[PDB]
């Protein structure tokens, strides 16, 4: 059974799924978030939603924004490299 | 670099693993040799065996005639022996054109040693395993024996042996030469020279060997010849004619 | 031997399937029978046709599986 | 000493017309007063509506032609059987001719 590398359509679904439970303020398209991943594993995806929430809590927020999700992709992938 | 025995470079200890292993297990190929000097000949006896009845033992060669006058006795395997033979033969011939003169044992020995050394430093070649004993009866020195060994080391002998009955051969000749006060025996005919050789051989290796189990190469002034099978039995029977 | 134990539609040709599998071992021919049944399980069939087995081979048996036809 | 270069005669005539063109040539091949051939095609079809004749000295004709025949073949392979244009073929010859002049 694979748990290696999923598709663009696939990355989108796993993002959509962790952020339901969260409050959010509008302007999110999952597709856009997915786009910034050149290659991921399931571990990385879980890290994008949870990290995106943290930028909001520092500013003191309950909601998540399109900006936050982008910011979390950039951090996670780059650390994974090397 | 790499490592010290995956490519040829110095060991931790300043040794070379490849030359020492080249000394050892290239004489254990069911080969034992001796060379002794005549008065006006040079004699070599060397073992040479054929394990099939289906292997023509004529082609089986480990005394080679390098030129019409020069012989080279190889201790070690036929893949190696022909790399050294090709070099020897070429060197012999080249020498003959260029310098106008027949090739001495010593010059050939020295040239081959230096070449092996270069191949020892190379990281994409090996030193050959073979031990090469070059024989003739030079008109510039008399009967001669010069031996090279695999490390790029070489040195002249008056009588030599190889294979682990080295001690036995040496001691019998040493005691003999200390008594007679000479390192060459005196006798004209080649026949009596081969009988002297056999005497020391039989005692020392503790056995006698068949015609096809021996190969005897004789150096004479301006000829080197190998003795036919009947000719090698004639000699073994001739000492036993005495008995 | 495999096809006694379990239902089949009694049309399945071992020789033909055998040409279709390359470098299969005995245990792996037994795992194809299981996968042929997993097709069958999804399909709502209680037996296996030839097709059902062909599809079984395509899926993993985990040591060798004949399905190669990709390259553009 | 040596110069193989001479002459072998023959005559060719090319006429461009309204939709058509001819390459007419005699079939006599000589070296001096001796007859080398009394039929030997002196117009030859290289393919692609291109017919060709190298009149003069034979020895150069044969060479010029062989270099060019392999170019017709290589043009096809390397460009998926796209047929050779009269103008393009003319440029290709120019380069051949110019390639030996030593």
């Amino acid at each position: 059974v694979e748990f290696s590398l999923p598709d663009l359509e696939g990355r989108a679904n796993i993002f959509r799924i962790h952020s339901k439970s969260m409050s959010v303020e509008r302007g999110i398209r999952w597709e856009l978030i997915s786009r910034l991943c050149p290659n991921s594993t399931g571990a990385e995806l879980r890290s994008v939603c949870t990290e995106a929430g943290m930028f909001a809590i520092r500013a003191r927020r309950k909601v998540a924004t399109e900006k936050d999700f982008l910011k979390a992709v950039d951090k996670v992938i780059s650390g994974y490299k090397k | 670099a790499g490592y010290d025995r995956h490519i040829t470079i110095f060991s931790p200890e300043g040794r070379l693993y490849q030359v020492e292993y080249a000394f050892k297990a290239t004489n254990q190929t069911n080969i034992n040799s001796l060379a002794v000097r005549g008065k006006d000949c040079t004699v070599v006896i060397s073992q040479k065996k054929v394990p099939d009845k289906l292997l023509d033992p004529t082609t089986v060669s480990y005394i080679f005639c390098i030129s019409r006058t020069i012989g080279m006795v190889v201790n070690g395997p036929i893949p190696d022996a022909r790399n050294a033979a090709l070099r020897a033969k070429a060197e012999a011939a080249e020498f003959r054109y260029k310098y106008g003169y027949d090739m001495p044992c010593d010059v050939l020995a020295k040239r081959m040693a230096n070449l092996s050394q270069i191949y020892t430093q190379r990281a994409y070649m090996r030193p050959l395993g073979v031990i090469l004993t070059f024989v003739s009866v030079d008109e510039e020195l008399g009967p001669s024996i010069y031996k090279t060994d695999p490390a790029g080391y070489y040195v002249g002998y008056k009588a030599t042996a190889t294979g682990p009955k080295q001690q036995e051969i040496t001691t019998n000749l040493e005691n003999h030469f200390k008594k007679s006060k000479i390192d060459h025996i005196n006798e004209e005919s080649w026949e009596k020279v081969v009988e002297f050789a056999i005497t020391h051989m039989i005692d020392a290796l503790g056995t006698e060997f068949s015609k096809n189990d021996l190969e005897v190469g004789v150096a004479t002034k301006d000829k080197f010849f190998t003795l036919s099978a009947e000719n090698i039995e004639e000699r073994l029977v001739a000492i036993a004619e005495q008995d | 031997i495999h096809s006694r134990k379990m239902t089949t539609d009694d049309d399945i040709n071992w020789q033909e399937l055998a040409r279709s599998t390359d470098e299969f071992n005995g245990a792996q021919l037994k795992a194809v029978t299981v996968e042929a049944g997993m097709i069958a399980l999804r399909n709502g069939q209680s037996s296996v046709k030839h097709e059902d087995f062909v599809e079984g081979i395509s899926e993993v048996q985990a040591r060798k599986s004949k399905s190669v036809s990709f390259y553009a | 000493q040596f110069n193989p270069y001479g002459d072998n005669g023959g005559t060719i005539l090319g006429i461009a017309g309204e939709d058509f063109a001819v390459l007419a040539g005699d079939t006599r091949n000589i070296t001096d007063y001796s007859i080398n051939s009394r039929y030997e095609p002196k117009v030859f079809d290289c393919g692609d509506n291109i017919v060709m004749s190298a009149n003069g000295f034979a020895a150069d004709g044969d060479a010029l032609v062989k270099r060019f025949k392999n170019s017709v073949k290589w043009y096809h392979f390397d460009h998926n059987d796209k047929k050779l244009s009269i103008n393009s073929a003319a440029r290709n010859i120019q380069h051949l001719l110019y390639g030996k002049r030593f």
Binding site: - | - | R19, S20, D22, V54, S67, Y71, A72 | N70, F77
Partner: protein, 233 residues
């Protein structure tokens, strides 16, 4: 270990040949199914062309080397081209030097030698591509199988690519019949299409995947390409 003998192409291993070489034989099966068949007067090549997409256009699985010769590839593309150029070069020179077309046999043996040289060279590699090379020379009709380690076999019929064993069962039965039809192109051609669709078992056949090439006693290298293969199914 695997990793111990894999790194350069100059090592043998206890198996009798290098691991990498087996991986080159494996690649052929990945690439396209091509069947080869002959009678004794003509020889027929049938090949399935694959592309990647709807809006992709096919990659050619027949490369014509001469007006009496061509070959099919199966496996790695980039090597199949480097080989087809070499064969072009070999062909032409034969014609320039010897006035000679280049026999299938003659070509196979030159190609083999080139293959040994690139499997003793350490930076070099097996090609990773097998080829079915067809011709009609003055040796008769021919099919040869080339493998990228230098294995060259002359055959009546064979297949490389997807379920080779698949096609081989078909051919071996219908063999005795079709090969004694000597002087009728169409039958041998019709047997080729009948075969190739039964090797398939996770693909289907269609007109513009299929492409047929025949060479023979009265057929100079001719491809039926796209539409015109319908009339051989």
């Amino acid at each position: 270990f695997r990793n111990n003998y894999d790194g350069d192409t100059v090592t043998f291993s206890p198996t009798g040949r290098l691991f990498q070489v087996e991986y080159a034989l494996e690649a052929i099966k990945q690439g396209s199914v091509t069947v080869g068949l002959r009678s004794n007067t003509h020889a027929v090549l049938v090949a399935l062309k694959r592309n990647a997409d709807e809006l992709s256009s096919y990659q050619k699985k027949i490369i014509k080397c001469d007006e009496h010769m061509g070959l099919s590839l199966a496996g790695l593309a980039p090597d199949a081209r480097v080989l087809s150029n070499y064969l072009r070069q070999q062909c032409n020179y034969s014609s320039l030097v010897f006035n000679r077309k280049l026999a299938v046999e003659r070509a196979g043996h030159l190609l083999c030698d080139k293959a040994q040289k690139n499997t003793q060279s350490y930076g070099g590699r097996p090609y990773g591509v097998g080829l079915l090379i067809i011709g009609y020379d003055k040796s008769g009709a021919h099919l040869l199988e080339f493998q990228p380690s230098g294995n060259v076999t002359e055959l009546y019929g064979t297949a490389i690519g997807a379920r080779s064993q698949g096609a081989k069962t078909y051919l071996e039965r219908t063999l005795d019949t079709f090969i004694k039809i000597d002087g009728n192109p169409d039958e041998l051609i019709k047997a080729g299409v009948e075969a190739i669709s039964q090797s398939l078992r996770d693909e289907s056949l269609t007109v513009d995947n299929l492409s047929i090439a025949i060479v023979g006693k009265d057929t100079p290298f001719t491809i039926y390409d796209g539409e015109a293969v319908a009339k051989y199914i």
